[PDB]
Design a protein around this ligand. Structure first.
Ligand SMILES: CCOC(=O)Nc1cccnc1
Ligand SMILES: CCOC(=O)Nc1cccnc1
Lengths: 300, 237
């Protein structure tokens, strides 16, 4: 079990750790988060009390180094940092643990939610979507735009998601215009899965990595990316059977976890009604359709 | 974006543009089978592509053999439409290619957008106008060349005949649309109007009769009357 110590909490802030969150009051004696499960990628995120504008946060993997949080009063946010002196880090963490100034990552033992939401999310790929190579962790906020959004403006601070565009030469073979536009199997299976991702796990990882940035930061371009990657599968007549089974499982847990009150801005009515009710794979997402219809029958 | 009454005069500026109408591409007769079922028999049709400034009509003719062994023909027909417009542009010299193509039905936008990905600088646009181009198969000479075709081919016409010698394209287009609206609302009366006086003939190289300026005014007014009329007969006013 790993730990993300905080130097201090000088400003009132809601802190998120994966799908959990807790309130810290201005100058409350808070010194971080303990018992974080090794083996998964995590995100630790922030919403200031005084300015709910800008949810921001950091993707990290405790196996990749010792990380801490330190408020920076010039730039005005809680920054993730790496401590390279490992003896200094253990000593600091042990003091805070002894004085019981850390909140415990509150995992219920029955609960596989986090694993089911990050199963294919890979930290090494995250560094490439969110390019900042001097750090082993990756910062994301509400306002960051995607590479494709910047095509339709600071490239260093963008989300380099995989470019998917259904009306594009990459997506449409000369001479199969209608075939390829109505049945996207060529674009999914040859162009994307065989040419760009290499395998379905890499593809599931971005879909999971898209969704989590939408849910945790209200990142619009990430929501667009999640929906695109769903639609490309649902609109392909030929999908490996194991990908459809896994997809159903992935979406089921994403819909389960979504805040009940946020469905109106995170979920695209056209994509979901198309995918569940009109597309080639309309009969292939049984779990996802059962949970959508029982929880968001309004959208449909 | 879309084309409507407020930007109506863009059609006659000097940017090359084309209207595409696909309402006559897939045409069928519906009939009873010996077993008392219903079946369609397709007949030849055409893609109606028109330069509104010059009057040039690229009648790209659809023989029935193109539907053979195909499914979902109404959907295929929008893609067939998109495919034969795209190869026409490809063939055409660059300085003759359109800067805009305006489709008369929104269902064509995606088929045409996909077929023209290679021409990102050609704007594909819808329109709010209710243009009467479906009535083009009420022009006898066009109907004739479509029904006689034994293979897919493209015949070129000027739908304005020689009118641009005496009127502007705005006025020529308005005549054409009034003629077509009339033919669409009541083909018989519209046609009775056009051919009553046997002294006025259609030149072999024309679609419409050879009216003087004064005779066109009479004709145009009669066609308005007809369109007003049939509107009353249709709503009881
Ligand atoms: C584009 C090749 O696939 C990925 O990069 N997938 C990914 C991205 C981010 C997190 N986990 C997986
Ligand atoms: C339905 C008939 O289509 C054509 O005649 N198309 C065509 C293709 C290339 C160049 N010009 C015309």
């Amino acid at each position: 079990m790993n730990t993300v110590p905080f130097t201090s909490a000088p400003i009132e802030v809601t802190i998120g750790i994966d799908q959990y969150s807790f309130n810290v009051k201005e100058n409350q004696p808070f010194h971080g988060i303990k018992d974080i499960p090794i083996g998964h990628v995590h995100v630790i995120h922030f919403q200031h009390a005084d300015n709910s504008s800008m949810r921001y946060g950091y993707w990290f993997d405790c196996r990749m180094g010792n990380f801490y949080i330190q408020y920076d009063p010039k730039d005005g946010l809680y920054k993730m940092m790496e401590e390279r002196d490992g003896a200094k880090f253990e000593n600091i963490v042990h003091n805070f643990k002894e004085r019981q100034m850390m909140v415990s990552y509150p995992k219920i033992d029955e609960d596989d939610t986090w694993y089911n939401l990050t199963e294919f999310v890979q930290m090494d790929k995250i560094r490439k979507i969110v390019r900042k190579d001097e750090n082993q962790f990756s910062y994301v906020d509400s306002s960051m735009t995607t590479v494709q959004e910047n095509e339709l403006s600071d490239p260093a601070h963008s989300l380099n998601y995989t470019v998917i565009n259904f009306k594009s030469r990459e997506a449409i073979r000369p001479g199969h215009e209608m075939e390829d536009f109505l049945d996207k199997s060529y674009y999914l299976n040859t162009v994307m899965l065989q040419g760009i991702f290499k395998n379905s796990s890499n593809y599931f990882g971005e879909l999971q990595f898209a969704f989590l940035n939408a849910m945790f930061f209200g990142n619009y371009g990430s929501s667009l990316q999640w929906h695109a990657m769903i639609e490309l599968i649902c609109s392909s007549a030929t999908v490996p059977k194991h990908m459809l089974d896994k997809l159903d499982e992935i979406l089921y847990y994403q819909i389960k976890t979504l805040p009940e009150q946020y469905s109106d801005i995170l979920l695209n009515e056209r994509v979901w009604n198309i995918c569940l009710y009109s597309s080639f794979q309309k009969n292939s997402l049984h779990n996802t359709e059962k949970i959508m219809e029982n929880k968001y029958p309004e959208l449909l | 974006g879309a084309m409507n009454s407020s930007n109506y005069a863009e059609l006659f500026n000097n940017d090359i543009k084309l209207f595409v109408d696909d309402t006559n591409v897939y045409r069928v007769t519906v009939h009873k089978t010996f077993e008392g079922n219903v079946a369609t028999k397709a007949i030849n049709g055409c893609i109606f592509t028109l330069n509104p400034k010059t009057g040039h009509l690229f009648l790209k003719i659809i023989h029935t053999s193109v539907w053979a062994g195909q499914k979902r023909l109404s959907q295929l027909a929008k893609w067939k439409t998109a495919e034969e417009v795209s190869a026409l542009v490809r063939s055409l010299p660059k300085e003759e290619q359109p800067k805009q193509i305006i489709v008369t039905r929104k269902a064509m936008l995606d088929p045409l957008e996909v077929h023209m990905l290679d021409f990102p600088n050609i704007a594909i646009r819808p329109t709010e106008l209710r243009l009467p181009f479906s009535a083009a198969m009420s022009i006898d000479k066009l109907s004739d060349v479509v029904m006689k075709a034994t293979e897919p081919q493209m015949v070129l016409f000027n739908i304005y005949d020689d009118w641009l010698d005496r009127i502007s394209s705005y006025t020529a287009f308005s005549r054409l649309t009034l003629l077509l609206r009339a033919l669409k609302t009541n083909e018989e009366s519209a046609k009775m109007i056009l051919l009553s006086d046997p002294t006025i003939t259609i030149k072999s190289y024309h679609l419409w009769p050879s009216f003087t300026d004064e005779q066109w005014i009479t004709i145009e007014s009669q066609m308005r009357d007809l369109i007003l009329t049939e509107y009353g007969r249709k709503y009881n006013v």
